[PDB]
Design a protein around this nucleic acid. Structure first.
Ligand SMILES: [Mg+2]
Ligand SMILES: [Mg+2]
Ligand SMILES: [Zn+2]
Ligand SMILES: [Zn+2]
Ligand SMILES: [Zn+2]
Ligand SMILES: [Zn+2]
Lengths: 162, 162
DNA sequence: TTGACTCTCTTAA
DNA sequence: GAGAGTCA
DNA sequence: TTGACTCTCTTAA
DNA sequence: GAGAGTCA
């Protein structure tokens, strides 16, 4: 809601509720052949999810509170960042999972960044493999690696140079 | 169905036409602070584009040939790969620009890979910066770097551990 | 047979 | 990665 | 007021 | 990153 006090209240109620989600240990690649452990606070798979939470998509949730007798609703991972700018360089800020685990609502696993920055973490070599993200990755991105390219650059004739 | 000879003739006519596209010299980051040069064969900004070519979107084109009274049409960057498998690991193969220049139709700047592999090249450190793509990048990805994250992981209380 | 437009679609964050 | 509506 | 569903949308490859 | 229709 409009007031800073009301926004802090939303963040605090969200943190209390999410803090009661099951804590699931995930062992993750860090890059550089190293492994670490993350503690994700995972929203339940089915209703009930927790006070204020409802599922709007297979892996999409929303947080809802009644303030000033009106319903205020946010994407469930956006709540930690309600006091932050909602854009950067003209690009919309998104909640971005450092653990790449959409059910996780641990704010220590979330950052607030452009969708491009968000996506790019999928391929990051990780905090022990050369991550250069200013807000550092918690793990190597799940899509990091050589890829599975079927065909490389090629020509039949002699019309082209690299 | 088109024979492999007919497909080869399509690829040859496409190469002949694209080989007359304006060749533009671009200086690009390779990673590791090194700069290099790519030579892109750029489809024109407006019609006419070249024999067989037509624009179906802001940065989308198609190549069309009529063979024995039947009209055949392909995505304009897919033609080099018509003799290749069209899927891998259950994922559709996509034309993927190693030069990240959609107007370019230089087949020496294209590969054929999943959309995930394609996207991930946007953040690659580049052939002189640590690229691990089996079909190596030609340049550092345009989105490589520290990013512009607005807010990092944070909590107000003590409900969470990382 | 061809050019130059038109429209909607896929994927996974 | 999002916002918003329909019910009970 | 709160819960549990429904729908479509955004972005840039 | 795609496929397909209309019209002359
Ligand atoms: Mg993400
Ligand atoms: Mg690409
Ligand atoms: Zn997590
Ligand atoms: Zn990183
Ligand atoms: Zn090129
Ligand atoms: Zn690469």
């Amino acid at each position: 809601a409009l007031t800073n006090a009301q926004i802090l209240a939303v963040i605090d109620s969200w943190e209390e509720t999410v803090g009661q989600f099951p804590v699931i240990t995930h062992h993750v690649p860090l890059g550089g052949g190293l492994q670490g452990t993350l503690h994700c606070y995972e929203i339940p798979l089915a209703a009930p999810y927790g006070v204020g939470f409802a599922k709007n998509g297979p892996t999409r949730w929303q947080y809802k509170r009644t303030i000033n007798q009106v319903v205020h609703r946010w994407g469930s991972h956006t709540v930690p960042f309600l006091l932050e700018p909602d854009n950067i360089n003209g690009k919309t800020c998104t909640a971005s999972h450092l653990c790449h685990n959409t059910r996780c609502h641990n704010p220590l696993h979330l950052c607030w960044e452009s969708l491009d920055d968000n996506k790019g973490r999928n391929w990051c070599p990780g905090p022990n493999g050369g991550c250069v993200h200013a807000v550092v990755c918690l793990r190597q991105g799940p899509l990091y690696g050589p890829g599975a390219t079927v065909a490389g650059p090629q020509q039949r004739g002699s019309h082209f140079v690299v």
